[PDB]
Amino acid sequence: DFDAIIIGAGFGGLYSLKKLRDDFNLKVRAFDRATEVGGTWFWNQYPGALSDSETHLYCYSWDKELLQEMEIKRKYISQPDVLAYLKRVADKHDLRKDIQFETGIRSAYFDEENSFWNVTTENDEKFTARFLITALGPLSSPNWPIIKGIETFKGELHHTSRWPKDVTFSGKRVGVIGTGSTGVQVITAIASQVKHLTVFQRSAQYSVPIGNVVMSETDVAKIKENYDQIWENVWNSALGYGLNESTLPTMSVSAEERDKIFEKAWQEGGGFRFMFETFGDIAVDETANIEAQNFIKKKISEIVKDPFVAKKLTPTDLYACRPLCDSGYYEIFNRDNVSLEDVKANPIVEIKEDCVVTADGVEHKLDMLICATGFDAVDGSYKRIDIRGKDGISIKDHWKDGPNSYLGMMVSNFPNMFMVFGPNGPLANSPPIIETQVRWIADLIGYAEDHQINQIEATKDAVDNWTNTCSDIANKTLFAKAKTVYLYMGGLKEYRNQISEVSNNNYKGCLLKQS
Ligand SMILES: Cc1cc2nc3c(=O)[nH]c(=O)nc-3n(C[C@H](O)[C@H](O)[C@H](O)COP(=O)(O)OP(=O)(O)OC[C@H]3O[C@@H](n4cnc5c(N)ncnc54)[C@H](O)[C@@H]3O)c2cc1C
Ligand SMILES: NC(=O)C1=CN([C@@H]2O[C@H](COP(=O)(O)OP(=O)(O)OC[C@H]3O[C@@H](n4cnc5c(N)ncnc54)[C@H](OP(=O)(O)O)[C@@H]3O)[C@@H](O)[C@H]2O)C=CC1
């Protein structure tokens, strides 16, 4: 028996464990398939892996001594350094003694008689707990491209999600399929290391410089001396990225003024900075969105000296989402050892023992093929567990059409289960989201223990209520004319207001059962 079982030992699961064990004195065990803490920062060790958030904000805020001890080496933080940070958190707070590593959870079945969860590992070990905390992260299974003959390739074949140690690039012909955030990071990191690089691009996206520079001891001292105000700014913001979130309409200033504002953000770096510190309506007004696109289009044409390559890199969609972030991506395509293939116009039709074949019949001979082709959607990690709630309803069937929840944390028919960084949550920097959710869930569990209530479940109506306010906010946005509602788009501050009103009003929308 435990009071709570936690699935996952990334950012989300580690603070869940700290909060429930040490602040609410509950008996807790966490599980992870990994051999070490860190979650996605343990699993994802591909070349160029880098935070989107600046280093001083991509971390916990709840341990003030840890903040003052923070290593802030560069403006953004690389994967080995995030992993080392989370390892330090687990060291300082004695967390691993209550984490069972190398242990996958195969099933969790709710026992309506006892009002607790029966949790079974992949090695048939059974544990019981009143509450189930699912901290599964935003990514499900690695998505491989479905291409005839991929199994015949005899060279090195790697998905970015399983990047092996000891990979060497010198002298090799390498291909990369995929040009999302991970593909851009990999391509930028390895182009100078390989004999030849072929990029297989299905859809060009916009990318802005990230501006990753070293941090002087003075830069760092200025942050740490003001850290309380910095976090207060996070909690009162929509995105939690430390931005000065603009209200200025894009088309309310002159062309010369507009160019200077975009250039300012371009030089300082960051994708959210470009989209939301410049002007206030780029995600809302079609004309504003096109102006932002055209700024980046002009940059691509200036950086990439061959205009035919520049055209291939230039996105074609009418409206644009938030741009990627890079450390020298477009410059890569000026190199003599880089070839860009548009596989919308010239699709991949076959992989053979030594090559990728495109529809023009060209054999692209490769020593190594890197699939930066992404992951299944967030609800996949839930459906990959055999989770059965009331009446034995499985989460696979409950979410057959997509995920739906209350506040991003509670699922109807699944009592005493609480999601951390689950579907239908806010779009903001993730550590502040996870801290917000862990603290709300722990307060709810604490109120349960005080009031002797043993079953907490959100109602069908509350879920539909949450789905509607997500739909209503999203429909003021361009993001239907671009690439169930997966995200609450009201921002971090309003999300915290939303869940504060629920807890202040006796957990409206939650069925509470007393024993
Ligand atoms: C390179 C990179 C940069 C990023 N930068 C940012 C950024 O700047 N800002 C931002 O907001 N987000 C960013 N993200 C995304 C987000 O911050 C991370 O996904 C975040 O660390 C998620 O933490 P988590 O604990 O919620 O999930 P994860 O770190 O994904 O941890 C989930 C864990 O659950 C375990 N698990 C799952 N199913 C089971 C099971 N059945 N049994 C046992 N264990 C299981 C997994 O093994 C995994 O270890 C970035 C992601 C990457 C890859
Ligand atoms: N640094 C990071 O990696 C971070 C990632 N994230 C999130 O993590 C998730 C994963 O990012 P990423 O790993 O880049 O995965 P993405 O899904 O974002 O991009 C996948 C890439 O592979 C291409 N692709 C997929 N299938 C095929 C195919 N069959 N043939 C050819 N090309 C294909 C896609 O092209 P198309 O566009 O045509 O499908 C796209 O270019 C995203 O949701 C991202 O927002 C968030 C923060 C940081």
Side-chain angles (χ1 to χ4, degrees):
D1 244 81
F2 299 101
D3 293 304
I5 285 169
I6 301 165
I7 308 188
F11 265 104
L14 296 176
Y15 186 44
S16 292
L17 177 51
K18 171 69 190 178
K19 198 72 193 166
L20 294 173
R21 191 187 69 187
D22 286 350
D23 293 332
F24 285 83
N25 296 37
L26 299 162
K27 196 203 147 193
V28 184
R29 198 127 166 86
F31 299 85
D32 199 317
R33 282 196 182 97
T35 51
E36 179 57 294
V37 309
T40 191
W41 295 105
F42 167 89
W43 298 112
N44 279 300
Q45 57 182 21
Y46 63 78
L50 184 70
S51 66
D52 194 60
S53 165
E54 286 164 69
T55 298
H56 61 108
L57 297 186
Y58 193 64
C59 58
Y60 292 127
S61 78
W62 57 261
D63 182 338
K64 304 196 93 62
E65 282 70 52
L66 188 55
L67 292 169
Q68 295 299 317
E69 181 189 305
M70 278 267 308
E71 181 170 339
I72 298 176
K73 179 168 36 181
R74 287 179 296 264
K75 191 168 193 160
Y76 300 82
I77 183 166
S78 302
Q79 171 270 323
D81 292 338
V82 179
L83 180 58
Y85 170 73
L86 294 172
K87 289 192 187 181
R88 171 63 183 133
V89 172
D91 285 354
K92 180 181 169 179
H93 291 279
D94 199 11
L95 296 178
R96 294 184 189 84
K97 73 187 189 56
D98 290 307
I99 305 172
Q100 189 168 318
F101 292 104
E102 300 193 83
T103 304
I105 300 310
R106 185 207 310 135
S107 63
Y109 295 169
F110 189 66
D111 182 335
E112 284 167 274
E113 219 159 18
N114 280 109
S115 274
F116 67 52
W117 281 94
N118 286 306
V119 181
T120 305
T121 74
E122 292 177 334
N123 296 323
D124 308 291
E125 197 163 55
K126 193 189 95 171
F127 303 86
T128 59
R130 180 73 65 206
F131 304 107
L132 178 67
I133 313 302
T134 51
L136 312 180
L139 306 177
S140 190
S141 304
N143 177 71
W144 291 85
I146 294 172
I147 295 167
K148 173 173 59 177
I150 186 167
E151 75 283 351
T152 67
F153 188 66
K154 286 189 192 312
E156 298 176 75
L157 179 69
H158 302 313
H159 191 286
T160 59
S161 65
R162 296 328 300 261
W163 191 260
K165 296 262 172 93
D166 299 314
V167 177
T168 67
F169 297 112
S170 196
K172 296 179 187 182
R173 293 179 178 272
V174 183
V176 174
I177 305 175
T179 64
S181 57
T182 300
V184 158
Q185 284 177 349
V186 172
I187 288 159
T188 301
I190 72 170
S192 65
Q193 303 189 59
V194 303
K195 182 168 69 185
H196 188 88
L197 182 64
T198 304
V199 175
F200 300 99
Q201 173 196 270
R202 191 165 66 179
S203 303
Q205 300 183 227
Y206 293 105
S207 189
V208 303
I210 200 185
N212 194 16
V213 290
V214 297
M215 296 293 279
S216 71
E217 307 233 302
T218 288
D219 296 322
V220 174
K222 295 350 280 173
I223 283 163
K224 291 183 170 174
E225 286 168 16
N226 195 36
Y227 234 147
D228 288 346
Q229 184 61 50
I230 290 174
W231 285 110
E232 280 326 296
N233 290 351
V234 165
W235 304 122
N236 282 291
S237 69
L239 300 164
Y241 271 79
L243 304 176
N244 311 132
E245 296 173 353
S246 181
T247 58
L248 185 68
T250 301
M251 305 302 322
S252 72
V253 306
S254 64
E256 311 89 283
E257 193 61 26
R258 192 180 312 125
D259 172 78
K260 296 178 181 159
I261 288 168
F262 282 136
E263 179 70 20
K264 190 175 183 295
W266 183 273
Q267 289 302 313
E268 165 78 1
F272 285 101
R273 180 170 281 111
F274 189 82
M275 205 180 199
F276 300 109
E277 187 168 89
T278 48
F279 298 105
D281 58 350
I282 292 170
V284 165
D285 179 80
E286 293 95 331
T287 294
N289 192 271
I290 295 160
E291 279 294 304
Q293 293 183 66
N294 289 354
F295 185 91
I296 308 179
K297 287 189 193 185
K298 184 198 101 113
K299 288 294 189 180
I300 293 172
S301 79
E302 281 169 359
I303 294 165
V304 181
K305 301 312 192 297
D306 177 338
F308 309 92
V309 178
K311 295 166 172 153
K312 207 176 288 181
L313 292 157
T314 299
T316 68
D317 54 32
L318 182 31
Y319 304 115
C321 310
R322 150 255 174 269
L324 306 179
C325 304
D326 72 84
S327 298
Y329 178 66
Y330 293 121
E331 294 77 359
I332 289 314
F333 294 93
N334 292 324
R335 297 175 59 84
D336 290 340
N337 73 332
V338 176
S339 297
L340 178 58
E341 282 281 349
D342 175 357
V343 292
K344 203 175 252 173
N346 183 33
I348 299 171
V349 302
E350 197 185 3
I351 287 171
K352 304 189 80 188
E353 71 172 293
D354 57 356
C355 65
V356 168
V357 191
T358 44
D360 58 4
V362 168
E363 293 184 352
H364 304 267
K365 291 181 181 289
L366 300 171
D367 299 304
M368 170 190 306
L369 184 59
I370 302 174
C371 294
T373 42
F375 302 81
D376 288 347
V378 53
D379 53 311
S381 301
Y382 281 87
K383 295 164 159 180
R384 298 241 146 231
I385 314 177
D386 184 12
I387 308 178
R388 305 216 209 270
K390 282 191 316 173
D391 273 296
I393 298 162
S394 81
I395 197 97
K396 252 191 289 293
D397 293 320
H398 187 50
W399 281 351
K400 79 165 101 63
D401 288 348
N404 65 322
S405 70
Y406 189 35
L407 311 181
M409 290 182 274
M410 284 162 302
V411 190
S412 197
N413 292 320
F414 297 81
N416 294 3
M417 181 185 91
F418 296 103
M419 311 186 288
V420 175
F421 208 41
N424 321 116
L427 193 178
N429 200 19
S430 69
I433 299 174
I434 279 157
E435 287 188 0
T436 296
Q437 296 173 334
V438 167
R439 281 191 291 257
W440 191 92
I441 290 155
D443 279 348
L444 169 50
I445 290 177
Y447 166 106
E449 302 268 296
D450 292 1
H451 285 5
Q452 321 198 39
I453 77 89
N454 60 318
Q455 203 174 293
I456 308 162
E457 175 188 1
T459 62
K460 219 262 200 303
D461 295 341
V463 165
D464 293 323
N465 191 299
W466 187 247
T467 301
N468 285 334
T469 111
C470 289
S471 266
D472 284 324
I473 293 171
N475 297 318
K476 323 214 190 293
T477 294
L478 289 181
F479 292 157
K481 320 228 194 212
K483 316 196 317 299
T484 58
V485 193
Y486 283 66
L487 289 168
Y488 170 86
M489 303 280 282
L492 181 61
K493 174 185 175 183
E494 284 314 313
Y495 176 76
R496 289 165 58 78
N497 278 338
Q498 288 297 300
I499 73 182
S500 266
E501 292 200 347
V502 166
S503 52
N504 285 336
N505 286 95
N506 289 113
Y507 294 102
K508 90 166 97 180
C510 305
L511 291 155
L512 311 171
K513 204 174 127 173
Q514 274 179 300
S515 190

